[PDB]
Structure 1
């Protein structure tokens, strides 16, 4: 319950926060909503010497459309994502997913950037951002760069970010008007990380699937983008034979943990059932 001692900073700008993180090095961590970091400080699994709170940086908060993308600041809270009627109109999967994350209190504090950056395979946003083909904007001492969500995760708490960088924004391509979408999660209770979950976006024309993308949550040590499973839906009527193929291809890439949610063979099969159910709801929406 009790964390180790640390020094606490409130930088006023992205530039200042990056300067601090760079100077302080490995012993400093950004502090966003604190609802993954503070819990692991309380267990002393994390014992940073410095916390760099991002609270006073207004440029990190916000939702805007820019070109063919929606750009969401890293400090935008889950509660704000749910509340955004502009996001609901453009990217309605985000509200659906966010309502499946944690509980009201946690959603008031937890941020989209923190959910993306944290590195726990339990987080729901990473696979959704892989499904949507989102890009993460990072700023550090050497300047800006972009890392695809699909390329950001290497393992539990291992990600493509470098020393002294902040994830400043998430850039999400806006799906076509009329697209289908779904996030389908299996969990033990409110607040629980998924036994398995699937994110789907797809478009249809003339009764046939034109595009499909699939993410899978918490059925490996990272989120997964189920590339082949999405591809096999394209050109089909999203009928039983097509879904059986997609389920096979998605199950094949899983490598779940065996924990209180059940053994790895169950979770693999649940990835497939979530996928089936998500594709069906997305089809109907399309």
Structure 2
């Protein structure tokens, strides 16, 4: 319950936060919503000697539209995603899926940027950011750079993000009219991390699948994009056999960890099940 001693820093700009990361080094950690970092510190799983609070930086906040691209500030709190009239209209998948993350209280603190940077396979945004084709803007001592969600997750708690960088914002293309989407999350109870989850974003064309993205949650050391699963639907008609083929392709890439949520056998079968459900739900949403 009791976290170890640490120094608190609260710079008002991304630049100064990056500067602090540089002078303090690996002994420092960026403090966003604190709903992953504090819990780990309280259990003494992580013991940084310095915390750099980034809650007072205005450029890390806001939800705007730059043409056909939606730009969400990294410090955007989970509940603001849900209540954003822009997110609701341009990225309905994120507004609805966010309701499945933790609880109301945690959602008033945890951020979309922190959920992603934390790099926990258990988190929902990583798979969501893949299906939605998001791009993350990072700022370090050498300026900024934009990286895609697909390929951003390297290992458990490991991302493309460098020790001296700060994720500024999340850019994602608005949904085309008639875009189908869905997030299926199997969980033991409300506010728990998924036993298995699948994020799907797709577009239709008559009775065929014209565009498709499928991502898997908590069934490997990182979030997974089911490319072969997409390959079983792209340009093909939407049939029952096609969906199962995709499910089998999703299942084949699963590498779940055995824990209290179930064994590899269960999690894999469930990943497939969440895929089937997500695809049918996503298809039903297409116009």
SS in structure 1 opposite 2:52? strand
1:161 corresponds in structure 2 to 161
1:52 corresponds in structure 2 to 52
SS in structure 2 opposite 1:151? coil
1:217 corresponds in structure 2 to 217
| Structure 1 residue 238, shift from structure 2 partner | 2.0
Pairs within 5 Å for 1:3-18: 3-18=3-18
| Structure 1 residue 236, shift from structure 2 partner | 2.6
| Structure 1 residue 78, shift from structure 2 partner | 0.6
2:79 corresponds in structure 1 to 79
- Say which is worse superposed, 61-70 or 275-284, in terms of deviation: 61-70
Pairs within 5 Å for 1:170-181: 170-181=170-181
Pairs within 5 Å for 1:121-270: 121-270=121-270
Q: 2:43 aligned with 1:43, yes or no?
A: yes
SS in structure 2 opposite 1:55? coil
Number of equivalences:
286
**Which whole-Å CA distance do the structure 1 matches of 2:124 and 2:207 have between them?**
30
| Structure 1 residue 239, shift from structure 2 partner | 1.3
1:271 corresponds in structure 2 to 271
**Which whole-Å CA distance do the structure 2 matches of 1:65 and 1:256 have between them?**
37
2:102 corresponds in structure 1 to 102
SS in structure 1 opposite 2:108? helix
**Which whole-Å CA distance do the structure 2 matches of 1:156 and 1:97 have between them?**
22
**Which whole-Å CA distance do the structure 2 matches of 1:273 and 1:128 have between them?**
18
Unaligned runs of 5+ in 1: none
Residues 194-251 of structure 1: CA deviation (Å, up to 9, x unaligned): 0000000111111111111001000001000111211221223321110111011111
RMSD between superposed Cα atoms in Å: 0.9
| Structure 1 residue 127, shift from structure 2 partner | 0.5
Deviating above 3 A after TM superposition, structure 1's stretches of 4 or more consecutive aligned residues are none
Unaligned runs of 5+ in 2: none
Q: 2:114 aligned with 1:114, yes or no?
A: yes
**Which whole-Å CA distance do the structure 2 matches of 1:62 and 1:228 have between them?**
36
**Which whole-Å CA distance do the structure 2 matches of 1:228 and 1:174 have between them?**
25
